[PDB]
Design a protein around this ligand. Structure first.
Ligand code: NAG
Lengths: 109, 52, 118
């Protein structure tokens, strides 16, 4: 499984980094993707290929991965950037499957 | 109508309402309780293939 | 591309439920399709997916044995059947699409979702 901090909070206009520490089987040998989920809506893809952004995603979202741990960074926080964030990867050893992270609540002040 | 003999008078009439996708077919198949989108004189078809 | 699920269902424990997902465009797709579920107050869980042309189906060890995924290509529909329902199966289900023909961790298009209550 992928472990993330349960909750991180910061003031508007600041910079927030959300982590996630798996193992050598899930993150250490595969890519990581980052999804955002607003209340009442389906999850929305934010980052894929560990640094790439889909069309329509603002530049203030970024991602990286060092060794076993991946990080998602958000700058220029607004009131509308408060939602759930999930890290997902493609675990593959006994029987491969998609594994999502525990989730992290981003609260703004 | 005017007559002085030999008339078989009307008694009932019909007020018609039109629509598309109907017809008269001749068949020997029995009637069942199913639901389909295509009907043939031999049986119903439940398929999305382009040919039959 | 738009994915539309079926209606909501109310089932009894021990029964089975089948749901369908319809995708806009040409009947034949060049991308894989996966099924995800989420319980209230919890996170998403991946159930299984299906691959075009080859027709291979993959499932999760938690859901292996009870779930079956099939596809009908000339109508562009994907069906998922779940059996041996319990009280913990109450959740909202989504059908999601991948960019390629392989089942991976990146899904770019999701559906509205449908609720299954037991
Ligand atoms: C045709 O398919 C529809 C779709 O579910 C079904 O309701 C109907 O019973 C089927 N009819 C026959 C004759 O198989």
């Amino acid at each position: 499984v992928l472990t993330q901090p349960p909750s991180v909070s910061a003031a508007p206009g600041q910079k927030v980094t959300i982590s996630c520490s798996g193992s050598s089987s899930n993150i250490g040998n595969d890519y990581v993707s980052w999804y955002q989920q607003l209340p009442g809506t389906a999850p929305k893809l934010l980052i894929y290929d560990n640094n790439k952004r889909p069309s329509g995603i603002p530049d203030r979202f970024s991602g990286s991965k060092s060794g076993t741990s991946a990080t998602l960074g958000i700058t220029g926080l607004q009131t509308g950037d408060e939602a759930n964030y999930y890290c997902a990867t493609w675990d593959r050893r006994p029987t491969a499957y998609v594994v999502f992270g525990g989730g992290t609540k981003l609260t703004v002040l | 109508f005017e007559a002085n003999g030999n008339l078989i008078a009307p008694r009932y009439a019909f007020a018609l309402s039109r629509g598309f996708g109907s017809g008269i077919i001749t068949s020997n198949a029995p009637m069942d309780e199913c639901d389909a989108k295509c009907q043939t004189p031999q049986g119903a078809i439940n398929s999305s293939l382009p040919f039959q | 591309v738009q994915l539309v699920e079926s209606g909501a269902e109310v089932k009894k424990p021990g029964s089975s439920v089948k749901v369908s997902c319809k995708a806009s465009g040409g009947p034949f797709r060049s991308y894989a399709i996966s099924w995800v579920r989420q319980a209230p107050g919890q996170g998403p869980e991946w159930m299984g997916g299906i691959i075009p042309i080859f027709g291979t189906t993959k499932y999760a060890p938690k859901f292996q044995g009870r779930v079956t995924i099939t596809a009908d290509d000339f109508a562009g529909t994907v069906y998922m059947e779940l059996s041996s329902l319990r009280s913990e199966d109450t959740a909202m289900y989504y059908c999601a699409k991948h960019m390629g023909y392989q089942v991976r961790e990146t899904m770019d298009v999701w559906g509205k979702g449908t609720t299954v209550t037991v």
